[PDB]
Each structure stands twice: as C-alpha cells, then as structure tokens.
Write a protein that binds this ligand. Structure first.
Ligand SMILES: Nc1ncnc2c1ncn2[C@@H]1O[C@H](COP(=O)(O)OP(=O)(O)O)[C@@H](O)[C@H]1O
Ligand SMILES: Nc1ncnc2c1ncn2[C@@H]1O[C@H](COP(=O)(O)OP(=O)(O)O)[C@@H](O)[C@H]1O
Ligand SMILES: [Mg+2]
Lengths: 537, 98, 98, 526
C-alpha cells in the first residue's frame, strides 16, 4: 500500500512549517547580538571551555544543529567570512525572515515558484538601486571614510570605545601592507597581519608593531636577545646532525675508518652553519629544528637563532624584509654558496617582555614596512573576543580600499529599499507582486532589531525612519534624506552622512544575494524523507 | 557536428566550488585544476608551455632493491653531491626545453 | 604524457596564452588555463553556489541540460512539451482501441 | 524507537535577567571567598589538592587556582587573578574584590531599565580618569638608595606570612633582584624566574635562610677520589655526553678477521680519551655536563684532578652559566678560553640531611643567584617560596618604574574624591554610573577595617572627610591598630605598576561580564 521505506516520511505543510521554525530557532539566537546595542553570548562546551563571542560566524559554527534547514543558515554564516568578513549576523536574520514571510504566502495557496521568481525580481532590483544611490567614493572623505567605517564594525563588539584608538590602528595596518599586482590592482592582504594575544594591561596598551611580531622564543639562553642592524636569514631545513636516508647505509669493513664517519656527521652539519654565518647574518629563522650541538655556533659568534617557526610566518617575514626562502643548496652545481646578496634586512630584532612569555619583534623590516598588532586584554576570554573583532575590522577597510564605495549603515539601506520595492511591485506586478511586497517587509527586520536591543520605541522609531525615506523618493526637491538612520543612544532618526556611520557596499550587496539564494533552497522542501541512522547494522 | 551521431559527456568536466552565486558560473574551455601550486611565488605566466611529466624528480632508485655502501671518509661527500648533480641534470633538461 | 626524461622534447609540450592560479575569495583557489593552440573536444564548467546543497542540485540540473542536447544528436527530432504528446497518445490510442 | 524531531539537541538556552543578574552573583561569590585575605590581619586558608597535597596559604592567586568551578562567569574571575599574578607580584586579591564591587554597583543600574552599554561607556570614561589621578599623587623613588627599596618590599610582605621575619626576607628579596639584573646588549632585563631559583630544603630554622652568591644543586660527585672542596675552580660547562653512543645512521660493521673485534673495543676507549684530552688543554677543575659520563671518562679526569658532576639539569646549567660567566658548549674539541668559568669562588660539596648538595658560591659578580630556604617542613616552605615570588616581582616593578602610590586605603580614596568632583560637569544619564565607580573603590578601605574588627561607619565618615581637602590627600587605613594614620609616617607604599594593573583589570572584568546576555551550554567540539 504505502511506501515501504524504513525511515520516516512527512509531506504537506508539516515540513513547510518546520523549516521556518528551524530558521527562526537560529535567528532568535543571534537577534540579541546585532548593532551597537547588541550583547555578547557565552559558548560553554562539555569539556569546560568557555567562548565569549558575539560574531554570527563563531556562534553558529560551534553550535550543534540537527535539522537540514538549520545547516543551510549555519553554512551561510561561514561563507560571509571568506567573501566579505563582517556581514555575518545580518545575513542570518534576513534569510530567516525571507522564509517567514514566504510561509505566509504559501499558506494563502500561492505557488512557491512565484515567490522564488518574485524574490529574484526584488533581489536584482535591490542591487540596482544601491549602486545608483551611493553618496561618494573615497576621494572626498579621504581618511575620514576609513576611520568611520572601522568604528561601525567595532560598535557591536568589545572594542567599541568612544575614542579612535582601535580605529586608527586598523587603518594604519591596512595602509602599510599595500601590495600592488598586475593590471593596476592595489591588493590589501589582511591575512598577513599577525594578530597576537597576551593577558596583560588594558585595551589602551595595544601595541601597533610596525614590522612583524614573531610568536617564538630564542631557545638557548646564551644568545643576544637584541640585535641592532640585523640581517635576517630565512631558511627551511632542520639544523640537526647529518642523518643518512633509507637508501644509504654505513657498512664498514675496516675498524680504522669507524671514527672518521662518526665525526663526518657533525663536520658536514657545521660546514653549512659556518657559510651562512660568515656573510654577516645575525638572525636565523628555521621552520625545521636546530639541535643542541648547532646552538653553540650562534652563542660563540653572537648571533640569534630562532627554531621551529611557522611556515605561514616565514613567508610574511621574507616578503617584508627582502629575504629569500632557501630550502637547500643551489646555484648551478655549487658546493656551498648560499647567495649571500639575498639576505634580509631589519632595523632591530628585540625580544621584549609580554607578561611572562617571550615574543620576538622586528622593527620596520627595511624593505616593505609591514605591520603586526599585539592585543592586550584582561583574560583569555577577552583576547579571543578582541582577535575576532579585530579580524572583522580588518575586512571592512579592505573592501573600502579595494571597492571605493560605501553605503550608510544603521538601517538606512533597508529603509530605502523597503519603499522603492513597494513602488517597484506596483508597476510590473501581476501575480508576483506579493513576493516583492513581502521582500520589503523582510528587509525591515534589520532596523526593527536595532530598536528591540536598544529597548527603545519599536513601531514608532521605524515608522519615523521610513517617513524620511518616503519623502526622499516621492518629493524630488533635493531633500537628501537617503542617509537617514537610527540613533540608538537617543532614539531618534539621525543623518548617517555627518554622524560617520559608514558600511561597505558589498557588506549589503553580498548579504542580499546570499540570503535570497539561501531562501530559495529552503522554500523547496515540500516533501522530506528522513532515513533511520545506520550505525550498528 | 555533421560528422558523428554520438557524444561522450565524460569530455565535459564539472568543477564544484563553494562561493558566490549561480551567476558566477564560467564556461572556460581550458583546463581547471583543483590542486595547489608549489611553490606559489609566481602563480601567473603568459605564453606558457605546459608539459605533463610522469617521471619522479627525486633521488635515484630502481624497481629492484637498491642500497648505498659507505665505507670511506670521502664517500659520504660522494652521496650528497652526486644526488644534487643528478636532479640538476633533470631540471636543466626541463629548462632547456622551454 | 612524458615518462622518461630522454624523450622530453619540445614536441611533447603544450601551449597556453595564460596559465594562472585565480585567487578566489571563496573556498580557496584553482587553476585556469585560457587559450591553447589546436584545442581538443573538451570543455570545463565551473559551478558556484551559496550553499553546498545548491551546487549538488546545479550539477544534476546541468547534466539534465546536456543530456537534452545529447538526445538531439542521436535523433534530430523534437515534439511539443508541457503535456502535449500525452494527450495525443490518449486520443489516438482510444480510437485505436475501438 | 523513533527519534524526536528536535533542534540543537542536549544543549541549554538562557537569556534575559537570569544571565545579567546571574553573572553578578557568581562574581560576588568569589569575592566573598578571599575577602578575609587582604589586610595585614588576615588568616591562612588550608586547601586540599586532588594529588593528595595541602596548600596552606593566604595569597589570593594560590587560593583561586585550587578551586574548580562549574559556572562560566566564575571561570572568568579565576583567569583575572592569573593575569595579575604574572604581570605584578602583589596584585591578586585586590582585583577580585574590586571587580566584584564594580559589578555589585552595576547590578543596581540593570534593574533601572538601563542598557549595559551605557554602564560600560561610563566605566571606560571612569577608567581613563583613574589612571590620571594616580600619576598626580605619585612620588619619584631613588632606586640607588638601599633603605628606600627596603620600605617598598616590606609594604608588600606585611600582608603575607613572612612579616614576622621582615628584617631577613627584605634583604633576601632585594639582593636577589639586584644580582640577576643582567644587561648584555642595549636592553635592560630582569629574569627572576629562570635565574633566581628558590630552592627549599626541609630542616633547620628560617633565620638561617639566606640568598647565596651563586647557585646550588642537589648532586654528588661522580667519583670519591674527586675533590669536594676547591678554592678557585675553573668550571667548564658541557652539553653533550662524555660517552660512546650510536650515531644517527644505520651503521653496521662486518667483522671477518680476528683483530677487528678487539680494535673496535679499543677505538671506543681512544675516542673517549680524545675528548678528555681536549678539555684538559685549558687546565680546568670542574667539568659539568647534562648527559651521562662513562667510567672511561671518569678515569682520565681522576688522575688529572678534575671533579666531574654527571647529570645537572638544563635549567641549572643556564643558571650557573650566568653566575660563573661560563659558556655552555656542546663540542669538547671546540673549547675556548672564553668558555671557562673563571672568577668562581668557593666550591664545596656539603651534605644537608643525608643528601649531598653541590654549592658554587662566593662569586665575584654573579648574574644568577639561588635563594636557600630552610624551614620546619615542606608545607611552610611553599608559603615562603610563594611569598618571595611576590616579594621579588614587586622589586622588579620599581626598578622598571620608580613611582610609588600611597597604599592602605589612601590610593582608593584619593581617586574616589577625584571622580566625585569630576562628575559634577557630566550632566547626563552616564553621571550616575560614573558616581558608582568612586563608590566601588571604597571596598578596599572597607576590607582593612573588617579584617581587624574596626567600625565601618565611624571610620569611613572620617576618612571621606579627610580627602575633602586637597592638601593632605594621603590618609589611609592602618591595619595594625585600626585608626587613621597618614601613610607618610607609617611607610606603607605600593608601586605604580601594581595600582595601575589593579584598576585596569577590575574595570575590564566588569566590561566583559556586563555584555553577556545569553549562555549556551551542552555542545561538544573536536
Ligand atoms: N553607530 C551606529 N548607529 C546605528 N547602527 C549601527 C551603528 N553601528 C553599527 N550599526 C548597525 O549594527 C549592525 C551590525 O551588524 P553585524 O552584526 O556587524 O553584521 P555581521 O554579522 O555581518 O558582521 C550593522 O548592520 C549596522 O547597521
Ligand atoms: N600596614 C598596612 N596598613 C594598611 N594597609 C596595608 C598594610 N599592609 C598592607 N596593606 C594593604 O593590604 C593590601 C594587600 O593586597 P594584596 O592582597 O597583597 O594584593 P595582591 O593580591 O595584588 O598581592 C594592600 O592593597 C595594602 O593597601
Ligand atoms: Mg601582598
């Protein structure tokens, strides 16, 4: 008679109501961590680890989910870090409210393919309207655009101070790693900034190290820990005793030739260490291993040798100091040449005190003048929060300098799109106009969440918010009310042009493209079959 | 077309990568590989000549069991320096091809 | 495919106008060879997506699109769709049954 | 058995007032544990370890590390005292009481329908005004004076258990930092953990404890023919072994002739005698290595009158290299005249309680010393070791920052009147949480009278009236008697780095725990 599957089958409006409650179970979590009045959470594990964070990606990655519609919204937050980097609480609330308003349409016996086709006409029109209603590029504002866009990202986190201490350190970090490319591409690789953590003084003592901050120790306590006018030798091979390979064995037939082979394992080893040290090299960085026999040659000659450094840290030092990453001997059948003209340069390599640990600093690197940020917090829970908040702040200034276009934040984009799409649904709307009209109400949840978390008036402040944006579209008298946002500290609509509340363009363009595409896949689960777990057979 | 009535779909490779939207799909007629570049210091070359090599550029070894007998002081120098001269003749054979 | 280094000559090489590693913003990066002298009967389709579930559906929908043109190579004939031939199979076989 | 269609299985959800007012009570609970361990009239707290040991101490850091809590906000306060223990020495118990009081007044404003971001923005404005107040009431210190530095370290150990032997523990902790203050290149550093080793030996009296001018280890001589008393030895430090070991290869010898097996056994003896001839070219007296010494190496050093020590630790070799000025070499055929530890004083192999101890003392200018602790048992010697670590780090902060703050309640009352007078020009909704930071600083003079049994009403009313005038400004609480004595006459002075780290950590602890409105618990990880 029925289906003889050994799992479970649920059809109809059961799964159509379960996917909305699965998406609302995720959105109601992250609704309390949006905007400058948002608050952080606690993520306690079974082993006892506590993670205090408010970013939309760190919470949903550590949180376990079971529903298939819940894994779509959790993987939607992971894509926002790679594509944009701060846009990762706002996408989850929009994509869940896109399913909440579309559930009210399919309960009115409206076909979901008209809602899918109605959402594509509203998503492509939202990108078209936001690209024709921008204020200015990065020429008029200058450095004031980079600082004000950085403070908007920090307002939802622990580094949202009233001053410009953390804002100036981010702009000075991205501007110091300007790496040009072919065909006129000024790239800004923000992954080259080594963000370090140390439980020390307050947040106002966060050092901006112009150069690189290596997270390693010297090793042997007989080397000079401060070298002025240093020459960095970046190399990746273990400075240990000469061990033969698997194909080579030592089969001796004469007992007199025994001790000459035993001394040869250290003579070939020390032959490399004397030709890399006679060329003026004082700092040697190694990703392999330097044993206790080879540490004597640096104490005797007065050189610094750092062992077991990361491979991702050696590439950031050799590119910034002009050093060449050498793995072995080379240069056309040469015995030991080392190409001594390709040594790195540094002004000062100094191991400072980082509150009961050792940290090596390189000052200005003499070639590229890179930057590294050492964070200072109260405990380890604040340092993990300060690292995530700084990494999201580095991604904001990266997209502004690459794509010179900013949009007003604080719900100013979602207020203008809530009224333009209602007029867009009336012109060319015959049967898909109800999906475009619900696309505007789903976008209004971003200024609605700012009024809930601020404990302000909800149905009056957003009603006063769209009152200025309606007069900016139907009354062409140059009212300039396209930048009207929210003042959550006062509870009144303010102008985000003069207040300095700036967000990048692709933090909302890619947010509206990812949330609309995720809402289509969850809208097509009218039939769902769940099989039994095959564990013990 | 107009020469054969069969078509193999195994000549059309489909690469699945997470990121972007469906409008970011591409119809590149060349080769798309998912492997990384070691070393990644260049990652771009125009007027490139591509060569497929099935030889292993490493230490000399045979299908039979091969061992190195070291019974002299200078014999350890003749193992490391001849292995560097072996693969240098393999790289210079590759480099002089173009 | 070059197996031995003694047969590695310029005739066994390829050609490419641009062979670069396109640094993507999403899940890593891939290679992309653009242009080649005397191209073969192969092509590569790069499929993107916002979730890992949309790319698996887009892979099956592309294969359902390439198989439609595959049927037109074997039989160069097509009919009207959208419930069109099922009605004509229902009326002509009813008159055939009488 | 069909599974239940749930989402986020086996985890908890909690939000609202139960998390904001729930983390306050977890912070008030830890502050009530160590509340009786701040003043000089404090008492010890006996703790029990899961290993079977006993930690009897009154220091605020050592108490909180032995407490395993299950509350997530309670785990944050333990990491606060761990941060204060690594930055400064005597900056532990004061931060946990102050962060509990700054959250005690923060719970009042959360009931008044005020947003937590308004209290934190008032806390950050109050934190920037507490740093500027301590820099105005500071005083420059003459670090070259010996009697001035003794009064700073005596103020930090009056709370601890070594206040009875204050005349001895101040001279030990001052001479320990001034010996290890080493400067090779253009960078001053003080390493009081890797070079100032504090070794404790059970037995004797505490009055016989003294800081040695050199190092000491628990190691006997390798052979009884070797000398146990050398006047001026030339110590050579080694790192490799004096034995014959297998090489890092696959070496195998085919023995076909009769004379081949006896030759390899003779070449093993000639290899040891070759490296023993290379170390006697500099004419040493003491050979110290980290690996084993074979008996063939002991024979050649016996007739050459060389005392050899066998298995000295690697951390002890780095400490004796600074005292004698030697170089830890790892190759006997690469020894130089600069690698010989000349200038070392008397070397004596004493025995303290049926166990030999190698003493290397009486050096000319050692850069590393060892504090010899001798007491009743290992229980109270762990107390003096933890108190000398809090006594050497408070001397390190003065040598890097010679500024003193008047402690004993005078530091907190000088800023609480500065925050009160500066709050008159606020005129906003952040004015009232700005006033609560000055009232939260009152818990430090509250604790000094609650431990000695004095009144908290008649004293705090008179202490608040003493800071109404701008002339005196340094009146604190005397924990010995219980009255109000000026700190210029008592001599209780705390360093600037202790009071700055106390205020910077107590505010930012309240910054982190006030932004927490949700707690998720019950998930696993990798
Ligand atoms: N000063 C401000 N005034 C009004 N709104 C703000 C202000 N600063 C930030 N916001 C709002 O807070 C929101 C924070 O979003 P966020 O959680 O950072 O997104 P994502 O999770 O993608 O990084 C932004 O959408 C922005 O509109
Ligand atoms: N003789 C004294 N008179 C008044 N107060 C004192 C006296 N001795 C110590 N104190 C006070 O006792 C407190 C002890 O603090 P403590 O717990 O040692 O801090 P930490 O935990 O950082 O070491 C100091 O803040 C100091 O003001
Ligand atoms: Mg103390």
């Amino acid at each position: 008679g029925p289906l003889s599957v050994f799992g479970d089958r649920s059809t109809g409006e059961t799964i159509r109501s379960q996917n909305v409650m699965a998406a609302a179970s995720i959105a109601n979590i992250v609704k309390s961590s949006l905007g400058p009045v948002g608050l952080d959470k606690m993520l306690v594990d079974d082993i006892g680890d506590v993670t205090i964070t408010n970013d939309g990606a760190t919470i949903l990655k550590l949180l376990e989910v079971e529903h298939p519609a819940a894994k779509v919204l959790c993987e939607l937050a992971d894509l926002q870090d790679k594509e944009v980097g701060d846009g990762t609480t706002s996408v989850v609330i929009i994509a869940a409210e896109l399913l909440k308003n579309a559930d009210e349409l399919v309960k009115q016996k409206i076909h979901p393919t008209s809602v899918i086709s109605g959402y594509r006409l509203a998503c492509k029109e939202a990108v078209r309207y936001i690209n024709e209603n921008l204020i200015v590029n990065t020429d008029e504002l200058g450095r004031d655009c980079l600082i004000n866009a950085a403070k908007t990202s920090m307002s939802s986190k622990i580094i949202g101070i009233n001053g410009d201490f953390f804002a100036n350190m981010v702009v000075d970090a991205v501007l110091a790693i300007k790496y040009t490319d072919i065909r006129g591409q000024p790239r800004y690789p923000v992954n080259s900034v080594n963000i370090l953590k140390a439980h020390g003084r307050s947040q106002m003592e966060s050092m901006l190290i112009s150069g690189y901050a290596l997270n390693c120790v010297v090793g042997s306590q007989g080397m000079p820990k401060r070298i002025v006018n240093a020459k960095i030798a970046c190399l990746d091979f273990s400075l240990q005793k000469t061990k033969m390979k698997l194909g080579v064995q030592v089969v001796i037939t004469d007992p007199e030739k025994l001790d000459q082979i035993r001394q040869r394992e250290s003579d070939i080893t020390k032959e490399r260490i004397q030709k890399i040290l006679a060329t003026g090299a004082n700092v040697i960085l190694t990703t392999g291993g330097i044993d206790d026999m080879c540490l004597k040659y640096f104490v005797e000659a007065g050189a610094m040798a750092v062992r077991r450094v990361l491979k991702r840290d050696l590439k950031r030092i050799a590119k910034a100091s002009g050093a060449t990453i050498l793995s072995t001997l080379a240069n056309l059948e040469g015995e030991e040449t080392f190409e001594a003209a390709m040594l790195g340069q540094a002004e000062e390599v100094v191991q400072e005190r980082i509150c009961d640990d050792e940290l090596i600093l390189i000052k200005n690197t003499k070639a590229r003048t890179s930057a590294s940020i050492i964070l200072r917090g109260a405990n380890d829970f604040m340092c993990d929060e300060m690292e995530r908040s700084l990494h999201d702040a580095l991604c904001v200034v990266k997209r502004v300098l690459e794509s010179k276009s900013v949009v007003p934040g604080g719900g100013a984009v979602e207020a203008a799109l809530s009224i333009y799409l209602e007029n867009y649904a009336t012109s060319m709307g015959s049967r898909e106009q109800l999906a475009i009209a619900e696309f505007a109400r789903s976008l209004l949840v971003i200024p609605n969440t700012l009024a809930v978390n601020a404990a302000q008036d909800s149905t009056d402040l957003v009603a006063k918010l769209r009152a200025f944006h309606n007069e900016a579209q139907v009354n062409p008298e140059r009212k300039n009310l396209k930048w009207i946002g929210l003042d959550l500290s006062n509870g009144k609509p303010r102008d985000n042009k003069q207040a300095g509340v700036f967000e990048p363009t692709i933090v909302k363009v890619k947010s509206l493209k990812f949330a609309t595409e995720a809402a289509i896949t969850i809208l097509r689960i009218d039939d769902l079959i769940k099989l039994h777990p095959e564990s013990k057979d | 077309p107009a020469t054969a009535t069969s078509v193999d779909l195994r000549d059309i490779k489909i690469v699945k990568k997470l990121g972007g939207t469906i409008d970011d799909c591409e119809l590149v007629e060349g080769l798309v590989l998912t492997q990384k570049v070691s070393n990644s210091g260049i990652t771009r070359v125009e007027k490139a000549k591509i060569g497929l090599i099935q030889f292993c550029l490493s230490a000399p070894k045979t299908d039979m069991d091969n061992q190195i007998v070291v019974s002299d002081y200078a014999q350890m120098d003749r193992v490391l320096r001849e292995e560097r001269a072996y693969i240098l003749n393999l790289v210079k054979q590759i480099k002089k091809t173009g | 495919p070059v197996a031995h280094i003694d047969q590695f000559t310029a005739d066994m090489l390829g050609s490419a106008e641009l062979a670069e590693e396109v640094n993507l913003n999403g899940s890593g990066k891939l290679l992309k060879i653009t242009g080649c002298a005397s191209p073969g009967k192969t092509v590569t389709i790069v499929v993107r997506g916002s979730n890992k579930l949309v790319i698996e559906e887009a892979e099956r929908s592309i294969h359902d699109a390439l198989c439609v043109i595959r049927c037109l190579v074997k039989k160069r004939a097509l009919i009207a769709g959208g419930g069109a031939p099922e009605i004509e199979l229902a009326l002509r076989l009813t008159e055939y049954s009488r | 058995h069909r599974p239940v269609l749930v989402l986020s299985q086996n985890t908890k959800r909690e939000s609202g007032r139960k998390v904001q007012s729930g983390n306050i009570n977890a912070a008030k609970t830890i502050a009530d544990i160590i509340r009786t361990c701040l003043g000089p009239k404090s008492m010890m707290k006996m703790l029990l370890d899961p290993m079977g040991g006993i930690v009897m101490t009154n220091d605020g850091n050592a108490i909180l590390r032995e407490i395993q809590v299950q509350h997530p906000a309670a785990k944050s306060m333990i990491e606060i005292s761990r941060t204060q223990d690594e930055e400064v020495g005597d900056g532990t118990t004061s931060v946990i009481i102050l962060a509990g009081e700054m959250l005690s007044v923060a719970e009042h404003f959360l009931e008044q329908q005020m947003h937590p971001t308004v209290v934190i923005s008032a806390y950050r404005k109050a934190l920037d005004d507490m740093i500027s107040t301590l820099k105005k009431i500071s005083i420059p210190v003459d670090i070259s004076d010996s009697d001035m530095m003794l009064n700073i370290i005596n103020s930090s150990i009056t709370t601890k258990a070594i206040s009875r032997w204050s005349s001895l523990a101040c001279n030990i902790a001052l001479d320990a930092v001034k010996m290890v203050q080493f400067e090779e290149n253009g960078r001053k550093e003080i390493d009081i953990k890797k070079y100032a080793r504090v070794e404790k030996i059970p037995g004797g009296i505490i009055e016989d404890s003294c800081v040695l001018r050199g190092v000491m280890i628990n190691k006997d001589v390798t052979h009884p023919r070797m000398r146990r008393y050398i006047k001026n030895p030339r110590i050579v430090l080694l790192d490799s072994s004096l034995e014959y070991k297998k090489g890092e290869s696959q070496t195998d010898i085919e023995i076909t002739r009769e004379e081949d097996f006896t030759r390899i056994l003779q070449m093993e003896e000639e290899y040891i005698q070759q490296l023993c001839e290379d170390i006697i070219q500099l004419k040493p007296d003491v050979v110290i290595t980290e690996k084993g010494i074979s008996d063939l190496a002991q024979h050649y050093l016996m007739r050459a009158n060389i005392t050899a020590i066998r298995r000295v630790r690697k951390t002890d070799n780095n400490r004796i290299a600074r005292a004698c000025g030697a170089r830890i070499v790892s190759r006997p055929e690469e020894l130089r005249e600069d690698d010989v530890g000349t200038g070392a004083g008397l070397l004596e192999i004493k025995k303290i309680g049926d166990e030999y101890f190698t003493f290397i003392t009486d050096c000319k200018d050692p850069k590393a010393c060892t504090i010899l602790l001798r007491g009743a048992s290992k229980e109270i010697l762990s107390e003096v070791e933890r108190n000398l670590q809090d006594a050497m780090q408070v001397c390190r902060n003065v040598l890097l920052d010679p500024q003193l703050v008047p402690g004993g309640g005078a530091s907190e009352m000088a800023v609480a009147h500065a925050l009160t007078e500066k709050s008159k020009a606020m005129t906003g909704v952040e004015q009232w949480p700005y006033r609560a930071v000055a009232q939260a600083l009152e818990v430090i003079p509250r604790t000094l009278i609650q431990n000695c049994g004095a009144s908290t009403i008649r004293l705090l009313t008179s202490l608040r009236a003493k800071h109404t005038q701008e002339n005196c400004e340094t009146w604190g609480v005397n924990g010995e008697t219980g009255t109000l004595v000026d700190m210029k006459e008592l001599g209780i002075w705390e360093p600037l780095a202790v009071k700055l780290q106390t205020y910077k950590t107590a505010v930012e602890t309240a910054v982190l725990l006030l932004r927490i409105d949700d707690i998720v618990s019950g998930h696993k990880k990798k």
